[PDB]
Amino acid sequence: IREILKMGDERLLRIAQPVPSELLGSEELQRLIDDMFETMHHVGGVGLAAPQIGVDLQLVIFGFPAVPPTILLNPRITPLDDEMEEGWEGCLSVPGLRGAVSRHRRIRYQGLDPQGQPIDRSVEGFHARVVQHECDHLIGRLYPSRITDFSKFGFTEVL
Ligand code: NI
């Protein structure tokens, strides 16, 4: 179990470094992953990025409309067309708040699994939204910085 960092921490705002090749397959990486799944499961989250626990690595985990349990390294996202869709987001680093955010409806995402094998998936809707949100942590973007409709940004208890 690790502490989740909160919005305002400078560590959330950095561009994350890639997982280096010598870590792929390794026990050190596996332990980071186990620590991340424990943390996410302990607070009831659907996704967690390594910078949210102060680890400066392009590594996200997610899973749950169901979403397959995935561990994604060094990701690259390619929007499949121009269609945008609005949805509710929250984040463990932004407790007590929700906002509506416009995201690509369809994306292809690519990256590596923990053993260094390629991932290549094309996805839509909520799965697409989750991946965009997690991958935004890796470039120092939290979901308030993506909001366009501020009428829909508020406290959970109130909205
Ligand atoms: Ni988040």
Among 110, 135, 140, 107, smallest CA distance to 123 is for 107
Q: Which residue has the tokens 């499961």?
A: 41
CA distance 12 to 55: 10
CB 42 within 8 A of CB 1: yes
* Strand 59-62 to 47-49 pairing: antiparallel
CA distance 119 to 60: 13
Domain residue limits, the chain: 1-159
Report the structure determination method. Answer: X-ray
Burial label for 137, CB within 10 Å (0-12, 13-18, 19+), is buried
CB 123 within 8 A of CB 131: yes
**Which residues have C-beta under 5 Å from ligand 1, the single-atom ion?**
91
CA distance 137 to 67: 19
Q: How many CB atoms lie within 10 A of CB 73?
A: 22
Query: Ligand 1 centroid to 116 CA: how many Å?
Result: 25
Chain centre to alpha carbon of residue 68: 14
User: What is the full DSSP assignment across 9-36?
Assistant: -GGGSSPPBPPPGGGTT-HHHHHHHHHH
How many angstroms separate the most distant Cα atoms in the chain? 47
Give domain 1-159's CATH number out of 3.30.420.40, 3.40.50.2300, 3.90.45.10, 3.40.50.620. Answer: 3.90.45.10
Cβ neighbors of 109 (< 8 A, separation 6 or more) are 72, 75, 76, 77, 78, 119, 120, 121, 123, 131, 135
Q: Resolution of this entry in Å?
A: 1.7
Query: Ligand 1 centroid to 82 CA: how many Å?
Result: 23
Query: Ligand 1 centroid to 143 CA: how many Å?
Result: 7
CA distance 134 to 59: 9
